[PDB]
Amino acid sequence: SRYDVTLDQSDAELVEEIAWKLATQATGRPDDAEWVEAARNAWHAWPATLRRDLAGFRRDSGPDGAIVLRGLPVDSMGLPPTPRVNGSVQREASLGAAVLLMTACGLGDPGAFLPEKNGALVQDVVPVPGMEEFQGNAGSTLLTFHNENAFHEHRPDFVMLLCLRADPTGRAGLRTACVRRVLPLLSDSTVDALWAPEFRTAPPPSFQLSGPEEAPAPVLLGDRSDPDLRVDLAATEPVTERAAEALRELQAHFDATAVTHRLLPGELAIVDNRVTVHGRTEFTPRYDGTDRWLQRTFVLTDLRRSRAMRPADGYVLGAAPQP
């Protein structure tokens, strides 16, 4: 399978060397344009085999709309305890930030949203005490299936998750479900419903004090046989009864066809957010610094499209127009 790639020893050693040099020698820090520029240049030093694998995935993300690469460099012996605060982000140069931002520049460009993790390009995904029931990074309850930032016009094209520390408890796993697997299984009425403009996905309160009551829109987008989708099973509200039934059937088939991944250190999951939803199983964190630790970076395949939301042609998307 070209969607599960283990680095051979030589390639893993070359990537480690490149990542260390970037992390230690590049001027500035990960969120600075000059550091992203260094990562972009560093990406082109990677082994050609890996660049070819990623280019292949970008061109065709396959029936599960996801790839896992294994054997990437993480400083396990140097890793501090897993962070325990909401909004934990990687502001300082590190091996993890190097790996993520280099890969981001290979697939497109990294990006982030000002109202989410303060627009940090490399974001920690860790369980936070008191946030157990929360539908987000910090929770440890069941995270229902969603496209990342489904409400947003310039939502991530890819979501990348690098594992620094595995969940020691064995109950946590990333779940990904692709529309390619479910579409041929869906009943005709459900398919019709999903193409109809009968679903409202409002932005979360963090993204606006508020205004424009979101116009109803379809869940399925683009080609009839190979559509994209835009859904959040927590946030998307059906406007009609048939839309409600359709979401229930959609969820059922996501659950039935989802791939569940327990990531290990040095493993990088890349999800095609145009065709694949993700979620996470419930688990019981230890909250003792040994818990699951992933770092996340979003990729925009055509950064240019979001320029109106990126002051100074930066990597942080805000808002506006207005009139």
Enumerate binding residues for Cl ion (CB under 5 A). 174, 262-263
Measured from the CB atom, is 148 or 267 closer to Fe ion? Answer: 148
Q: Is 296 annotated as a binding residue?
A: yes
SS3 191: helix
What does 22 bind: Cl ion, Fe ion, none (CB cut-off 5 to 8 Å by kind)? none
Side chain identity at residue 88, one-letter code: S
Comparing every residue's Cβ against Cl ion, the nearest one is: 263
What does 174 bind: Cl ion, Fe ion, none (CB cut-off 5 to 8 Å by kind)? Cl ion
CB of 173 to Cl ion, least distance (A): 5
CB of 319 to Cl ion, least distance (A): 27
Cβ atoms 42, 21 nearer than 8 A: yes
Measured from the CB atom, is 176 or 190 closer to Fe ion? Answer: 176
CB of 122 to Fe ion, least distance (A): 15
CB of 281 to Cl ion, least distance (A): 9
Q: Is 41 annotated as a binding residue?
A: no
Report in angstroms the alpha-carbon separations of 145 from 183, 235, 247.
16, 10, 11
Give the dihedral sign, CA 22/23/28/29. Answer: positive
The angle subtended at Cα 309 by Cα 304 and Cα 315, nearest 5°, is 65
What does 263 bind: Fe ion, Cl ion, none (CB cut-off 5 to 8 Å by kind)? Cl ion
Measured from the CB atom, is 67 or 263 closer to Cl ion? Answer: 263
Task: Tell me the C-alpha distance between 123 and 116, whole Å.
Answer: 9
Alpha helix ranges (H) inside the chain: 9-25, 33-43, 48-59, 95-107, 179-182, 188-195, 241-257
Measured from the CB atom, is 95 or 269 closer to Cl ion? Answer: 269
Determine phi and psi for 322, rounding to 5 degrees. 85, -155
Q: Is 261 annotated as a binding residue?
A: no
Under the rule (CB under 5 A), what is the footprint of Fe ion? 148
Q: Is 86 annotated as a binding residue?
A: no
Measured from the CB atom, is 174 or 186 closer to Cl ion? Answer: 174
The angle subtended at Cα 280 by Cα 274 and Cα 283, nearest 5°, is 170
Task: Tell me the C-alpha distance between 199 and 197, whole Å.
Answer: 6
Measured from the CB atom, is 100 or 243 closer to Cl ion? Answer: 100
Q: Is 146 annotated as a binding residue?
A: yes
What does 21 bind: Fe ion, Cl ion, none (CB cut-off 5 to 8 Å by kind)? none
Cβ atoms 158, 272 nearer than 8 A: yes
- Cβ neighbour number for residue 226 with a 10 Å cutoff: 10
Annotated binding site for Fe cation: 146, 148, 278
Annotated binding site for 2-oxoglutarate: 292
Annotated binding site: 116, 137, 146, 148-149, 278, 292, 296
